[PDB]
Design a protein around this motif. Structure first.
Motif, PDB file in Angstrom:
ATOM      1  N   UNK A  15       0.792  -1.225   0.000  1.00 38.71           N
ATOM      2  CA  UNK A  15       0.000   0.000   0.000  1.00 38.71           C
ATOM      3  C   UNK A  15       0.830   1.283   0.000  1.00 38.71           C
ATOM      4  N   UNK A  16       2.152   1.185   0.068  1.00 41.48           N
ATOM      5  CA  UNK A  16       3.047   2.328  -0.035  1.00 41.48           C
ATOM      6  C   UNK A  16       3.939   2.154  -1.258  1.00 41.48           C
ATOM      7  N   UNK A  17       4.336   3.280  -1.856  1.00 42.60           N
ATOM      8  CA  UNK A  17       5.245   3.241  -2.997  1.00 42.60           C
ATOM      9  C   UNK A  17       6.456   2.399  -2.650  1.00 42.60           C
ATOM     10  N   UNK A  18       6.819   1.496  -3.563  1.00 42.17           N
ATOM     11  CA  UNK A  18       7.988   0.638  -3.427  1.00 42.17           C
ATOM     12  C   UNK A  18       8.645   0.501  -4.791  1.00 42.17           C
ATOM     13  N   UNK A  19       9.815  -0.127  -4.829  1.00 42.20           N
ATOM     14  CA  UNK A  19      10.482  -0.400  -6.099  1.00 42.20           C
ATOM     15  C   UNK A  19      10.267  -1.851  -6.519  1.00 42.20           C
ATOM     16  N   UNK A  20       9.925  -2.050  -7.791  1.00 36.53           N
ATOM     17  CA  UNK A  20       9.655  -3.382  -8.322  1.00 36.53           C
ATOM     18  C   UNK A  20      10.969  -4.122  -8.587  1.00 36.53           C
ATOM     19  N   UNK A  21      10.884  -5.277  -9.258  1.00 34.34           N
ATOM     20  CA  UNK A  21      12.058  -6.116  -9.512  1.00 34.34           C
ATOM     21  C   UNK A  21      13.067  -5.437 -10.427  1.00 34.34           C
ATOM     22  N   UNK A  22      12.620  -4.487 -11.243  1.00 39.57           N
ATOM     23  CA  UNK A  22      13.502  -3.728 -12.115  1.00 39.57           C
ATOM     24  C   UNK A  22      13.975  -2.427 -11.484  1.00 39.57           C
ATOM     25  N   UNK A  24      11.856   0.015 -10.406  1.00 42.51           N
ATOM     26  CA  UNK A  24      10.949   1.094 -10.788  1.00 42.51           C
ATOM     27  C   UNK A  24       9.868   1.311  -9.736  1.00 42.51           C
ATOM     28  N   UNK A  25       9.533   2.577  -9.495  1.00 45.21           N
ATOM     29  CA  UNK A  25       8.512   2.902  -8.504  1.00 45.21           C
ATOM     30  C   UNK A  25       7.148   2.360  -8.906  1.00 45.21           C
ATOM     31  N   UNK A  26       6.494   1.713  -7.942  1.00 47.57           N
ATOM     32  CA  UNK A  26       5.308   0.890  -8.126  1.00 47.57           C
ATOM     33  C   UNK A  26       4.482   0.991  -6.849  1.00 47.57           C
ATOM     34  N   UNK A  27       3.189   0.668  -6.941  1.00 46.10           N
ATOM     35  CA  UNK A  27       2.332   0.613  -5.761  1.00 46.10           C
ATOM     36  C   UNK A  27       1.240  -0.416  -6.001  1.00 46.10           C
ATOM     37  N   UNK A  28       0.592  -0.841  -4.919  1.00 46.90           N
ATOM     38  CA  UNK A  28      -0.611  -1.648  -5.054  1.00 46.90           C
ATOM     39  C   UNK A  28      -0.279  -3.073  -5.449  1.00 46.90           C
ATOM     40  N   UNK A  29      -0.998  -3.573  -6.453  1.00 46.61           N
ATOM     41  CA  UNK A  29      -0.776  -4.904  -7.007  1.00 46.61           C
ATOM     42  C   UNK A  29      -0.014  -4.749  -8.318  1.00 46.61           C
ATOM     43  N   UNK A  30       1.278  -4.453  -8.217  1.00 45.06           N
ATOM     44  CA  UNK A  30       2.100  -4.299  -9.407  1.00 45.06           C
ATOM     45  C   UNK A  30       1.729  -3.150 -10.319  1.00 45.06           C
ATOM     46  N   UNK A  31       1.187  -2.055  -9.778  1.00 40.88           N
ATOM     47  CA  UNK A  31       0.898  -0.878 -10.600  1.00 40.88           C
ATOM     48  C   UNK A  31       2.174  -0.058 -10.781  1.00 40.88           C
TER      49      UNK A  31
END
Ligand SMILES: *SC1=NC(C)(C)N(O)C1(C)C
Ligand SMILES: [Cl-]
Ligand SMILES: [Cl-]
Ligand SMILES: [Cl-]
Ligand SMILES: [K+]
Length: 164
Positions: A15-22, A24-31
């Protein structure tokens, strides 16, 4: 199991901005918010996507709303693409979910470039397609997820998502 449950397993819920596997800034369910390294840019994308001033945090309902839009957009990208649409139309519903999963993760243009894998899928040469799909940056960088998606293409079953 269905495409929503499948992508929820593969992408998680945060539910907070995070970085994905690449990275990149992401949130939610892989948004995915942005490929820019600027957190301020990611925050502006989030506020625009949700329609309010967020502090970088959203609710679960908001995450599910973006997720529904993102699944819809992945399907629309497949249907509007001259390379992906015939393959999608040729597939059963379980394998269609596997293709939507790939487009959700990599985008329409990226998946449309898998020319030889797409041909093998259209030919219903499932073991050969599985071997070809693994010869990819996609598989090397996210091998456990790619193995689940590939098993879904290989078998036409949900076996790779069952005990998850
Ligand atoms: S959202 C957001 N924008 C700034 C850069 C102020 N942040 O630190 C947050 C809270 C992640
Ligand atoms: Cl959006
Ligand atoms: Cl057929
Ligand atoms: Cl091959
Ligand atoms: K994720």
């Amino acid at each position: 199991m269905n495409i929503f449950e499948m992508l929820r397993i593969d992408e998680g819920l945060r539910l907070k901005i995070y970085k994905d596997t690449e990275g990149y800034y992401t949130i939610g369910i892989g948004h995915l918010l942005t490929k820019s390294p600027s957190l301020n840019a990611a925050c502006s994308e989030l506020d625009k996507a949700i329609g309010r001033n967020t502090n970088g945090v959203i609710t679960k309902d908001e995450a599910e709303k973006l997720f529904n839009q993102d699944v819809d957009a992945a399907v629309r990208g497949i249907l509007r693409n001259a390379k992906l649409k015939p393959v999608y139309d040729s597939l059963d519903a379980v394998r269609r979910a596997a293709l939507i999963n790939m487009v959700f993760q990599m985008g329409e243009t990226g998946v449309a470039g898998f020319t030889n894998s797409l041909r093998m899928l259209q030919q219903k040469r499932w073991d050969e397609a599985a071997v070809n799909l693994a010869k990819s940056r996609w598989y090397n960088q996210t091998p456990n997820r790619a193995k689940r998606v590939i098993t879904t293409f290989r078998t036409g079953t949900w076996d790779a998502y069952k005990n998850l």
